[PDB]
Design a protein around this ligand. Structure first.
Ligand SMILES: N#Cc1c(-c2ccc3ccn(Cc4ccccn4)c3c2)n[nH]c1N
Ligand SMILES: N#Cc1c(-c2ccc3ccn(Cc4ccccn4)c3c2)n[nH]c1N
Lengths: 216, 205
C-alpha cells in the first residue's frame, strides 16, 4: 500500500517524468514517495569522479565501488530491496513487478558507462536483498530508462498510486463504427456476449501465434 | 541522419531526450472539441477506454509520409530487440505513436499500414500505463547505433584492487590477455546459464 523509492543516478533530471506522474492524492496519503539522488553527492575528489578504467582491460569504463558504496550505505537499510538494472540481469517481468509492488523500500542503482564494479552488489547482498535485472533484450546507455520502466510497472500495481484501475490481448475498437473504409467487427455490436468473448479469445490466439509463438 | 517524431498526450514525459532530431507532439493539438477528447468506451465491452482513431488519423496524416516507419508501442506487440534496434538505426524517419488508456483503436495501425510501414512492438513482458516510457527505451537503444554515434556480460571491476576485504579476481590483475579473455568468456557463459538459460537454448525457470 505504501512504498518509498530512492533512485541514484548521475542524471537525476532523467527521473523527472515519474515524479510528475505521481498524483497528489497518493503523495498526500503517504502511499508513495519517489526521491532522486545525484550519485556525485558521494564522490571523494574535486573532479567528482564516478568512473575508472576496467581491470583486465577492454573498452569503456567501470563505475567506482567506493562512491557507490558510500551512497548505498547512506540510502539503504536492512529492509531495502536494491534493484540494479543491467543488460546482464535476470529478466524483469510482470511477476517481478507484482512481487516488488508490496515492498516498503526500493532503491534503484542506475549505472552508466559499462556498469558498476561487481563488488558493490556483492557487498550489498551480504546485508540486504539485491536484484540485478534487465528490462529486455536490447542495450541501453545506462539504467535510467530501465528505472522509469520498473517504477511505472511496479507503482501501477500499488492501489491508488498512479491513478489507474498467457496470451496477448487482441485488437480494441471504439467509435465511429466505420472509419476510413474500415468497420468495427460486427460481432462486437451484436449483444451476444458469449460469442464476443469467444471471438476475442480467437483474436488473442491468432495474435499470439503471429507475434509471440514462444508463449505457446 | 534521422528524424524522430513522438506523439503523446503527455509531452512532458518525453523530456529526458545534429545527426538526429527528436520532436514531441501533443496529440490533443489535433482535436476540435472543447473538452479535447481523445478516448471513448470500447465496442464489445471491457474495462477502461480506447483512443479514438479520428484524432490519431489526423495527427499521423500531418506527421507521416510513405517513407515513415510508424512505431506503435503496445504490450501485445512483436518483441523489440537489439536486432530491431539495429534495423531501425538506419531509418530516415521514425514516428512513435504513444498510447494511453487501454490502447489505440486497431484501425489506426491498420489504416497507416496501407500507406507506410508500421511496427507494433513491445519492449518487454510487463505492463505499463502508456507508450511514453517505451518510446524512451526505443529511442535510446536506436540512437546509440546510428552511424556517427547472444550472451550476458560478465562482471567488471575497477580500482582499488581490494575493497571492504573483497578482491578483484586475481586473473584480471595478471596482465595475461589469454587467461583474462578465457576467464571473461567463462563468466559470461556461467551468468547466461544462471540468469537467461533460454539464450543458450535451455528451458526457462
Ligand atoms: N535493465 C537494463 C538494460 C540496460 C542497461 C542497464 C544499466 C546500465 C548501466 C550501463 N549500461 C550501458 C552498458 C552497455 C554495454 C554493457 C554494459 N552496460 C547499462 C545498460 N541495457 N539494456 C537493458 N535491458
Ligand atoms: N511497448 C510497450 C508496453 C506497454 C504499453 C505500451 C503502450 C500503451 C498504451 C496504453 N498502455 C496501457 C495498457 C494497459 C493494459 C492493456 C493495454 N494497454 C500501454 C502499455 N506495456 N508494456 C509494454 N512492454
Amino acid at each position: 500500500g505504501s512504498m518509498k523509492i530512492d533512485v541514484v543516478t548521475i542524471f537525476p533530471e532523467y527521473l523527472q517524468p515519474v515524479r510528475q506522474s505521481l498524483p497528489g492524492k497518493a503523495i498526500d496519503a503517504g502511499l508513495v514517495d519517489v526521491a532522486v539522488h545525484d550519485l556525485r553527492r558521494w564522490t571523494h575528489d574535486v573532479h567528482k569522479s564516478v568512473d575508472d578504467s576496467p581491470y583486465g582491460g577492454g573498452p569503456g569504463m567501470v563505475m567506482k565501488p567506493t562512491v557507490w558504496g558510500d551512497a548505498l550505505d547512506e540510502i539503504c537499510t536492512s529492509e531495502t530491496l536494491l534493484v540494479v538494472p543491467t543488460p546482464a540481469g535476470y529478466p524483469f517481468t510482470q511477476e517481478t513487478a507484482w512481487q516488488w509492488s508490496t515492498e516498503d523500500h526500493l532503491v534503484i542503482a542506475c549505472g552508466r558507462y559499462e556498469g558498476i564494479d561487481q563488488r558493490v552488489a556483492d557487498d550489498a547482498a551480504t546485508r540486504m536483498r539485491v536484484r540485478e535485472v534487465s528490462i529486455g533484450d536490447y542495450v541501453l546507455n545506462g539504467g535510467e530508462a530501465a528505472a522509469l520502466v520498473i517504477i511505472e510497472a511496479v507503482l501501477r500495481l500499488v492501489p491508488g498510486v498512479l491513478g489507474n484501475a498467457s496470451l496477448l490481448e487482441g485488437p480494441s475498437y471504439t467509435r465511429p463504427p466505420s472509419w476510413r473504409g474500415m468497420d468495427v467487427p460486427p460481432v462486437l455490436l451484436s449483444g451476444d456476449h458469449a460469442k464476443i468473448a469467444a471471438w476475442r479469445a480467437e483474436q488473442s490466439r491468432q495474435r499470439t501465434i503471429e507475434r509471440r509463438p514462444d508463449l505457446l
